[PDB]
Amino acid sequence: MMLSLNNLQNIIYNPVIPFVGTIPDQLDPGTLIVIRGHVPSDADRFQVDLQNGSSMKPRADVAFHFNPRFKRAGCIVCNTLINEKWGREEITYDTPFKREKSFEIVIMVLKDKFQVAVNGKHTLLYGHRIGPEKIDTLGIYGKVNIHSIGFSFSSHMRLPFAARLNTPMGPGRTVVVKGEVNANAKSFNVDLLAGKSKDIALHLNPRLNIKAFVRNSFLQESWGEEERNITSFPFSPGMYFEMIIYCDVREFKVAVNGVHSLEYKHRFKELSSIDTLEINGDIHLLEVRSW
Ligand SMILES: OC[C@H]1O[C@@H](O[C@H]2[C@H](O)[C@@H](O)[C@H](O)O[C@@H]2CO)[C@H](O)[C@@H](O)[C@H]1O
């Protein structure tokens, strides 16, 4: 598995092992935990435990025990601890982890199971044995060096919304946004910027109060000429919408609710440099997809 957008809520760097920390939000379905680190050359085993509390006597129940072990075969042992008792063991062989090799673990929470990919490859599924709402602490123990842990909750779409584009911008790349305009909305914005050069390749600014759709670029510390021509303002306060920003070789093509609205000749020519998406304004953000 791979993430199209980097928009993590909490981030922790270099926690000391053993590390036991409180999960900053509820693991509702769709929630992501990203763990980046590497295993030392002398690693016998390490484990990532999703727990209900952090008591050690009685040992706190472990809803999800993810335990990579290094041996001739190499595997990941998964299990659950309830009232200090382990349940049915589930072993996944052909382990993706290696001594002296770095790794990225993406744990996805679903309604009935955790889905786990390591280094961009599906690794294993583990059905919930404990309700996920009962999980409130992340424990990490053993021989492993953790660089960072990050999270993505249901709240990942609050405004302002800022997200890095793990896929560099280029012809054929699509960015769709779905949401609902606030009942008393004035305006909102969707910008595609080249994070580095502090430039805005594309500024999509629907202004509802004056009922116009402004698009422009902010280049070299200066706003350019605004483009407002349009067959009809597609937005209404309180209206559901989907907007498709399609990057083409000659321009950006944007549609709303299944209808082409406008084209925008590229002003920033280094497309591959457009690596940042920002959404703000008077809307309720429902979904953002980089493709
Ligand atoms: O089941 C998870 C739990 O296993 C303990 O060790 C197991 C071991 O995995 C298995 O091969 C053997 O047959 O039984 C042992 C006793 O449960 C680990 O010590 C513990 O840390 C967890 O990984």
Swiss-Prot record:
Record site: Critical for binding to sialylated and sulfated oligosaccharides: 59
Source species, domain of life: Eukaryota
Binding site for a carbohydrate: 69, 79, 89
Record note on quaternary structure: Homodimer. Interacts with CALCOCO2/NDP52. Interacts with PDPN; the interaction is glycosylation-dependent; may participate in connection of the lymphatic endothelium to the surrounding extracellular matrix.
InterPro entries noted in UniProt: ConA-like_dom_sf, Galectin-like, Galectin_CRD
GO MF annotation, one: integrin binding
Outcome when changing residue 164 to H: Does not affect localization to cytoplasmic vesicles in case of infection by S.typhimurium
Compartments where located: Cytoplasmic vesicle; Cytoplasm, Cytosol
Record-annotated disulphide pairs: none
CDD domains: GLECT
PROSITE patterns per UniProt: GALECTIN
Record GO biological process: cellular response to virus; lymphatic endothelial cell migration; plasma cell differentiation; T cell costimulation; xenophagy
The keyword Cytoplasm appears for this protein: yes
Binding site for a beta-D-galactoside: 223-229
PANTHER family assigned: GALECTIN (PTHR11346), GALECTIN-8 (PTHR11346:SF22)
GO CC terms: cytoplasm; cytoplasmic vesicle; cytosol; extracellular space; membrane
Gene3D superfamilies listed in its UniProt record: 2.60.120.200
Keywords, alphabetical: Autophagy, Cytoplasm, Cytoplasmic vesicle, Lectin, Repeat
Function: Beta-galactoside-binding lectin that acts as a sensor of membrane damage caused by infection and restricts the proliferation of infecting pathogens by targeting them for autophagy. Detects membrane rupture by binding beta-galactoside ligands located on the lumenal side of the endosome membrane; these ligands becoming exposed to the cytoplasm following rupture. Restricts infection by initiating autophagy via interaction with CALCOCO2/NDP52. Required to restrict infection of bacterial invasion such as S.typhimurium. Also required to restrict infection of Picornaviridae viruses.
Record's protein name: Galectin-8
Domain comment quoted from the record: Contains two homologous but distinct carbohydrate-binding domains.
Domain Galectin: 19-152, 161-291
